[PDB]
Amino acid sequence: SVYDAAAQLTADVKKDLRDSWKVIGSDKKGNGVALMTTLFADNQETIGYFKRLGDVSQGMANDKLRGHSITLMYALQNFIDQLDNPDDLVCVVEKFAVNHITRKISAAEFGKINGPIKKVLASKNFGDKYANAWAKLVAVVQAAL
Amino acid sequence: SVYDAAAQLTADVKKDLRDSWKVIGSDKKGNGVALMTTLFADNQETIGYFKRLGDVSQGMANDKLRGHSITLMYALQNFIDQLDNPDDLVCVVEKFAVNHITRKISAAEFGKINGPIKKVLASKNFGDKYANAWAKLVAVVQAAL
Ligand code: HEM
Numbered sequence: 001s002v003y004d005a006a007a008q009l010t011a012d013v014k015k016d017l018r019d020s021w022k023v024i025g026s027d028k029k030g031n032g033v034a035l036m037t038t039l040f041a042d043n044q045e046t047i048g049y050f051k052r053l054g055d056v057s058q059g060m061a062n063d064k065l066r067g068h069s070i071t072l073m074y075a076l077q078n079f080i081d082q083l084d085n086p087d088d089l090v091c092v093v094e095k096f097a098v099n100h101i102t103r104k105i106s107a108a109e110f111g112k113i114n115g116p117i118k119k120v121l122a123s124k125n126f127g128d129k130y131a132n133a134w135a136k137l138v139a140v141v142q143a144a145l
Numbered sequence: 146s147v148y149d150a151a152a153q154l155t156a157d158v159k160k161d162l163r164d165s166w167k168v169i170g171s172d173k174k175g176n177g178v179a180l181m182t183t184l185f186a187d188n189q190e191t192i193g194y195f196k197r198l199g200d201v202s203q204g205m206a207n208d209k210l211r212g213h214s215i216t217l218m219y220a221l222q223n224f225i226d227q228l229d230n231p232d233d234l235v236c237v238v239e240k241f242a243v244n245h246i247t248r249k250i251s252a253a254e255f256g257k258i259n260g261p262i263k264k265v266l267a268s269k270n271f272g273d274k275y276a277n278a279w280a281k282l283v284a285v286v287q288a289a290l
């Protein structure tokens with residue numbers, strides 16, 4: 001239930017998400033590409049799903065990957081902005097869930113993004129506390145897959 | 146090319162885009178739904194394209210339409226944020242162009258959005274000068290369709 005998952009976003013969790021996003025969201029291009037490259041490096045079995053982006057090993061030099069990465073960061077910006085209203089958070093989460101359902105991405109595979117999130121957060125001096133907060137947001141999307 | 150279309154957006158145009166977005170973008174849910182509902186009212190022939198959203202006449206109450214509309218506003222937020230770097234604007238515009246090319250939306254059909262944009266801008270007292278500025282940004286997307 002995406003609704004029960006959304007209920008897990010308590011006051012403390014929402015605060016950690018916002019505080020960490022202020023830093024991470026300030027460089028969408030850089031952190032977005034870092035997130036994607038980390039995903040591909042740590043989970044090579046996921047590269048097949050991104051055939052449309054071409055050679056993802058080119059990282060920032062790949063125009064399609066950069067466009068994709070920047071756009072992905074605005075999906076997260078969207079989620080953060082909807083934290084105040086669960087009804088709105090849910091409808092945007094389901095809209096994005098559809099985009100992945102069509103690509104045949106399961107809740108389990110979507111969850112593979114938690115590893116990269118923790119690593120990027122760590123490189124910015126945000127520990128486990130913050131990685132767990134983000135895992136709860138990711139869990140809302142997983143509930144819709 | 147798309148680059149030529151973007152590279153042409155002048156300082157005055159970007160200024161008008163940013164000033165109007167400060168207001169329009171401060172209420173993404175309200176203005177996004179208003180944009181979509183206006184498109185369906187003035188161009189009923191486009192309704193068929195949005196069958197995934199269910200009954201679009203339900204407006205705000207339709208969760209799928211609400212989620213689509215809010216998300217649409219973040220694509221625009223993305224564009225506005227990339228105005229000072231044509232290279233980044235181009236790659237995000239091309240990514241979004243693919244989403245519509247797959248739905249068989251032509252450059253001409255995409256331009257139908259200019260009417261609704263003009264009307265919603267007018268509701269917030271932003272005149273022709275501003276509508277012309279947005280038509281120029283829409284033209285950047287049309288260059289990719
Ligand atoms: C923080 C989590 C994630 C976010 C916010 C996110 C966001 C996005 C966005 C905005 C798009 C573009 C949607 C479209 O235009 O159709 C997208 C595409 C895609 N995502 Fe994700 N995603 C996430 C995690 C994942 C994971 C972990 C996988 C797979 C292991 C995945 C697989 C895909 C694929 C295959 C595409 C299509 C790429 C293309 O061909 O353009 N995503 N994602």
Ligand code: HEM
Nearest residue numbers: 099191194195197216217220221244248250254255257258
């Ligand atoms: C300011 C102009 C516009 C913006 C920024 C915009 C934005 C978006 C976004 C972000 C999506 C979701 C992409 C995806 O998940 O695959 C979308 C989907 C779509 N757009 Fe647009 N769009 C615009 C104008 C139009 C116009 C004028 C038409 C048609 C006359 C159109 C037809 C569609 C269709 C059919 C979909 C698929 C909806 C669905 O089934 O989920 N768009 N648009």
